[PDB]
């Protein structure tokens, strides 16, 4: 439904802003040396807040720009890896992973955009899919490895961060392939919007929880 897609854009706008202000307000409840991930988490929700306002306006206007979603992803998806690295690493090791995982995440979204902006089932579509899927798997394997050697409450807090991404991000590549299986355009927009709220606000809340554990909570 077209009115549903629009209503969900408005629910996402409000959920993203609620997440932004929750995370900024909660940042003071954790120690300064563990705040970086909470701040980056709030920034991700704030960018998505701005983009969901623009998507809702674009939609109601009758000129829905499918590119707004990818501008949001190319910014927020690398930052989401960064907000996780901000609680698992510091110093040189953090900067190294921010560069390496951040570039990988940008390539994944860029390959997706290359494929999305072609005829469905076209060669460009499949090139995009394979390069983005390969980078996705590479990132999910890096995330699995990031947990190795963690202990006690930090191992449990990291498991939750890792599994939100592992389970919660499957919908994105699933949605991409859907249109070659049939007509799933309207449902894909709805499911991506719900997924974005859960993934972005949920990951920020779990990064906050890791930062609380690390602060001695
Ligand atoms: C490289 C990643 C490409 C991001 C997609 C993009 O920039 O899309 C522009 C769109 O037309 C603007 O709404
Ligand atoms: C190191 C782990 C990274 C391994 C990356 C594995 C790549 C998998 C892949 O190529 O996915 C393409 C997709 O299945 C299209 O059929
Ligand atoms: C806040 C938004 C998020 C976390 C969006 C995540 C999006 C992806 C993981 C997209 C992945 C894709 C592939 C793995 C292959 C097909 C192309 C994409 C870009 C849909
Ligand atoms: C409408 C979507 C609601 C999600 C935003 C919730 C704001 C964060 C509060 C989480 C509590 C932990
Ligand atoms: C127009 C785009 C909307 C952006 C809204 C920003 C919401 C506020 C979040 C600010 C967080 C600052 C970034 C912190 C970086 C961490 C470094 C330590
Ligand atoms: C066209 C706008 C996209 C530019 C790509 C910049 C990479 C984002 C990393 C943060
Ligand atoms: C390529 C991804 C770069 C992310 C920029 C933000 C880094 C925050 C530094 C702490
Ligand atoms: C509509 C598609 C969105 C599906 C989201 C996947 C569900 C979230 C996965 C939860 C994993 C971590 C749970 C932590 C709870 C504390
Ligand atoms: C047919 C169009 C209706 C689409 C509704 C999608 C509902 C998905 C909800 C997933 C979990 C609930 C939170
Ligand atoms: C449907 C909500 C599931 C999303 C999981 C996010 C983690 C909640 C943190 C407490
Ligand atoms: C569809 C809206 C679901 C909101 C989930 C976001 C994470 C909840 C935080 C606890």
Residue numbers in the entry: 1 to 217
What do the authors say?
Here, we have functionally and structurally characterized a representative of the PR family found in a widely distributed clade of marine actinobacteria, Candidatus Actinomarina minuta, named MAR [marine actinobacterial rhodopsin or MacR (16)]. In summary, the sequence alignment and the photocycle measurements confirm that MAR is a member of the PR family, which functions as an outward proton pump at neutral and high pH. Overall, MAR consists of seven transmembrane helices, A to G, connected through short intracellular and extracellular loops. A retinal chromophore is covalently bound to Lys200 of helix G. The fold of the MAR is similar to that of other PRs.
We determined a 1.6-Å-resolution structure from such crystals, which provided a molecular basis for the inhibition of proton pumping in PRs under acidic conditions and the role of the His-Asp pair in it. In contrast, the structure of MAR under pumping-inhibited conditions shows that His51 and Asp72 reorient to form a 2.5-Å short H-bond (SHB). This reorientation of the residues and formation of an SHB indicate that this pair acquired a proton from the acidic solution. Considering these rationales, we will refer from here on to the structure of the orange-form MAR at high pH as the ground state and that at low pH as the M-like state. In contrast, under acidic conditions, the already protonated His-Asp pair cannot accept a proton from RSB, preventing RSB deprotonation and leading to the absence of the M state and proton pumping.
